[PDB]
């Protein structure tokens, strides 16, 4: 379901042999994540470097297309899915259980529940019962803010 | 003609107030641009990003 | 129905003797009295310090371990509609709330009042009898979030 | 199997609020972990002191309650053989010991292992890994029963 979504869509990067992390094509505009290294596949993005921004711990670009995920500036709170499980938008607050997540999981996207990319997560809380995660996300104005869960664990 | 009487008098001294001015504004104007490129990233990487 | 609500979900408060109220972690935060205090059962949860505020008699502290665990969000609007707590139900009647008389006792002091939905809306700490039934001082919130200690007449705490 | 045998033989160590361990009874002394420690409850044996070894990092002490109680026979060879433990059994890989991946973590340190004959064989201290199966921080004897630590590679102690 989401997997066919981001189906050539979430891109591995390989940490000399495993993923550390997944980069996302979105809205004409290439998404990486700082605090995980190593290096990307498909040349095509290899080739192009990343404009960088610290303070969101990520840095965007442009695309070489001859891909497009919406932006959503108004999220209803109910339940969206990611393709580990379900989450929930409890007040500002991302939601996952116990054992979800692990080393790796950062630079995810977590989209709506018909297509849409809502945020994407870098990482998380370590406590659980649908705990807080350390996510990005954008405002009503398209503006973006670093969710902060008060975990500094970035899963 | 002040800087080549003050050269003419003190040689120096003359030298060595000019080169600190020359070095002091264009480290001025150096670290301003630099502050002024910072600004410029810190306020319009939200806005980019849509 | 609320059984299952606060089953292992708020502590008793304790003054070395028997039951005497009840201190709930809501939202992150102990609500926790000033009137009744001594000793919060449960130890693992009494080892957080509790900052005072007697403007709305309240003690209130980050709760260890998992914050979202035991969480309790609140509520904004407060239709008048038909409210559940520990031993029944309570009417939001003009600003105040009508509860039968028969409740109360020292113990009554810790016990939130519960939406039919499952979210709080005020926390008991006090009792005022009007004939027919009680009323309650209580703390409640208002449209844009601002706390208001609700007393409505003269009314000892539990 | 092993749930009989180590029924009420493995005494939590605890850390407000937190099971990170448990501590074992081998030979009429306690053992007790000097990486991680604090509060032994059933206090009756709680109260011994232990006197502390870092070269194999343990405690080790004596018992209170009578001259045998709670006791487990150490075994001087080591089989290949076949071990049942807490969490599966463990094997004996020619002098390396592998344990399953998805088994261990923080909270498994100071554990027994048993073998065949229900005699303890060897202490779990900690972790490591080499893929399908993981090396675990352990306390052993050998032929002539001198214990001895291994800690394979960068093993974590849990």
């Known amino acids: 379901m989401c997997m066919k979504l981001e189906s050539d869509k979430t891109f591995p990067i390989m940490l000399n042999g495993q993923v550390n992390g ?20 498909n040349e095509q993005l290899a080739a192009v470097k990343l404009k960088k921004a610290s303070m969101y711990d990520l840095e965007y670009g442009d695309v ?25 938008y409890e007040n500002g ?23 849409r990319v809502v945020a994407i997560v870098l990482g998380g809380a370590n406590e659980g019962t649908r705990t807080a995660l350390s ?14 869960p008060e975990g500094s664990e970035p899963w | 003609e002040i800087i080549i009487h003050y050269y003419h008098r003190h040689p120096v001294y003359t ?3 000019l080169c ?14 630099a502050c002024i490129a910072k600004a410029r990233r810190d306020c319009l990487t939200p806005y980019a990003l849509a």
């Open chain 1, 93 to 115: 607050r991302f939601t996952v259980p116990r054992g979800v997540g692990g080393k790796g999981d950062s630079g995810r996207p977590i989209l709506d529940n018909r297509g």
């Open chain 1, 22 to 41: 997944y980069a996302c094509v979105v809205g004409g505009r290439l998404m990486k994540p700082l605090h995980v290294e190593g290096k990307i596949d």
């Open chain 1, 135 to 148: 996510v990005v996300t954008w405002n009503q104005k398209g503006v973006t803010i670093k969710d902060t």
């Open chain 2, 20 to 33: 600190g001015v020359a070095l002091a504004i264009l480290v001025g104007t150096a670290s301003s641009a």
């Open chain 2, 15 to 17: 030298v060595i107030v």
């Open chain 1, 64 to 88: 070489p297309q001859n891909d497009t995920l919406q932006y959503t500036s108004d999220k209803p709170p109910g339940f969206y899915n990611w393709h580990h499980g379900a989450v929930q």
